From a paper:
Originally described as Tcs (for toxin complexes), and more recently described as A5BC toxins in reference to their stoichiometry, all three subunits (A, B and C) are required to assemble a complex with full toxicity. YenTcA is the pore-forming and membrane-binding module of YenTc. It has an unusual architecture amongst ABC toxins, in that it is encoded by four genes, two of which represent an apparently split tcA-like gene (yenA1 and yenA2) and two of which encode functional endochitinases (chi1 and chi2).
The current manuscript reports a substantially improved structure of YenTcA isolated from a transposon mutant of the native Y. entomophaga, in its soluble (pre-pore) conformation, determined by single-particle cryo-EM and 3D reconstruction. Each protomer contributes a pair of extended α-helices that form a funnel-shaped longitudinal pore at the core of the complex that widens into a β-sandwich domain (the TcB-binding domain) at one end and is enclosed at the opposite end by a ring of five neuraminidase-like domains (again, one is contributed by each protomer). This structure—the pore-forming apparatus—is entirely encoded by the YenA2 chain. A predominantly α-helical shell incorporating regions of both YenA1 and YenA2 forms the next layer, encapsulating the longitudinal pore. The molecular interface between YenA1 and YenA2 within a single protomer represents a buried surface area of 2709 Å2 and the C-terminus of YenA1 is in close proximity to the N-terminus of YenA2 (separated by approximately 16 Å). Most notably, a ring of five histidines (H996) forms a constriction (to ~6 Å diameter) about 20 Å above the tip, while the final closure involves hydrophobic interactions of the sidechains of the five L990 residues. Chi2 is incorporated into the overall structure such that its substrate cleft is solvent exposed and opens approximately downwards.
Residue numbers in the entry:
A (entry chain D): 701 to 815
B (entry chain A): 156 to 304, 584 to 655, 701 to 815
C (entry chain A): 1049 to 1164
D (entry chain N): 2795 to 2829
E (entry chain B): 2001 to 2098
The structure:
Amino acid sequence: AKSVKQLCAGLNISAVTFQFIAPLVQSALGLEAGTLVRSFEVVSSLYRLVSIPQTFGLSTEDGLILMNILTDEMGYLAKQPAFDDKQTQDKDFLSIILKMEALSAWLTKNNLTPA
Amino acid sequence: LDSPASYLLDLYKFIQSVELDGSNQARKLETRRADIPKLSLDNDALYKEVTALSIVNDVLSGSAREYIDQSGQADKAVNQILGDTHFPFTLPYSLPTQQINKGLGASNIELGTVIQRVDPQFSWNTTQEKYNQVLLAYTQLSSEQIALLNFRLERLNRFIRLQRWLDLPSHQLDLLLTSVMQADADNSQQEITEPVLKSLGLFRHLNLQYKITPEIFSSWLAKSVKQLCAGLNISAVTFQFIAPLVQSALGLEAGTLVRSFEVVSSLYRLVSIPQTFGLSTEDGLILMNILTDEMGYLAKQPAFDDKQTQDKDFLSIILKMEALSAWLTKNNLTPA
Amino acid sequence: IHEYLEFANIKKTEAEKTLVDNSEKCAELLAEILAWDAGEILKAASLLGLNPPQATNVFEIDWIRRLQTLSEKTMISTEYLWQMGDLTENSEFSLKEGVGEAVMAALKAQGDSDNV
Amino acid sequence: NELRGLWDRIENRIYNLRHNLTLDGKEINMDLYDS
Amino acid sequence: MSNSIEAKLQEDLRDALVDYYLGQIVPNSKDFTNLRSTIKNVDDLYDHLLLDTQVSAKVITSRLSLVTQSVQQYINRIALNLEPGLSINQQEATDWEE
């Protein structure tokens, strides 16, 4: 089975986080085993979700907090890069990384935590 | 103009016209060793062509793996058949899924197979089958292949030739096996079976933790000058406990002058085993009394055929001594 | 610790066992006192008679001390540490072939660097 | 005796060339430190 | 990573070599088996396959060097000994000078 590749994705961040990845593949169609097709619309969204929070030193559980707090949803992680939704000013992705930086500065200035 | 290609083609178009024919191998071999003037990609790749030894592996193995396909013997099996043969001294079970389970599991933080002693039970005062998991886990160095233990006789000597799973010289296995095979009362060649093999895990354990030697392990498994000179290892003032030891045979404080092997190997057990844990003889006697209500197979025989009927077996006792030595190092108590 | 143990002991036969002790929040406080994961501790439901289980008032905590320290020696799950038990008894081979590869991948995820 | 010294010398020198990175010294890896 | 290298060696040091040697030569082929007596050691595998087996675990180099080395060794080897049964004319036997 594809379970070796499903586990080997855990190289960047530990595969115990993939309890959050079955909620991600709902932007397409998939299941914890059934995601074996690894389609570019899904794996580029894994690439967004694994890359962008680590620039600010966040864990996946802290990045999911910022998206929930700022946007009431996944903040264009798991979804598409907003590029034609930005053409209609709908919560655009190019603003989200600025908000992540602005909060990372304020939450470095003060001894609080995302949790 | 000149290039790595003008150097190569000045060889290639030269070797093509070395035409002598018939039954001779030379072109037959060279074409069997197949590659061509346009092997792959293009000649400008050269800077990225920098590669390790890994380049060789598919040139050997990639033709070799076709044997089951060519002979028609198998097809759905992706590779693993090369782990399933013997007679050309083929070295089976060699697939990395066996070896990494020893080496890689040690290489990080030095845990090994000893993890089976940790869970899920509340204390090591527990039933015999648990120790039989852990001691076999300590033996491993290999896999379930250990179930294998003129040609009709040499195929029995192959059980010593197949020491290859262990970094042991040819003098070690006869020294290791003869004492336990003498302690076992059975007569026929079936004495090689797993009820003996369990003992090598205890050797491996005491070697890795405390650096014992196969000689000392296989050894422990008026005359007044000699009666005193035994006091070299630990002071002879302890021999108030040795007149109680010789009651496993027949003897007296002077009358033990015969120094028989059933007695002096029990002195060898009693002087060696507690000192691995830094115990004095008076502390070792406490552990045996507390754990077993008796001498815990010190002073008596090494339990080897009493272990065949699960009677307080000696191979569990050294594990209990270690488990208490850890707990009594963790806490500032003393044996006394 | 007292308020947790007193809650774990409430009326298993007449009320709480068939209501799964409200596992979604009673097993949470057992994680919270450790500042640890409320997730993988639910693997304890693989033993002790379809209870949470939690009313065995020390041994589960005593084991979880060693699971928490093992979980800091290595990044392996308690779910995989269970397979390392199941493989003992001359068991089915594909589970060993998979567990060896899974432990290898868990080391690559740390490498010669440190990572996670 | 010269044949036996000669063939063992070339066997040792092939082993060194087959490692390469020694030159019977230690060219590639040196002076590295940690902690 | 530095310890996974041990397994990427071991599969070619042993597995790929012994299963090739027994299986291909003795039962399987009409490839090597037409020449059954010619191979008995790794020195024969080296001479016959033109490849540096069992050695050089740390070395790095271009693929062109390995391709070159095989022909470079062969055009030496045919002039080094007259097995297989080919021969070299006195001009060609002069010009290995180049």
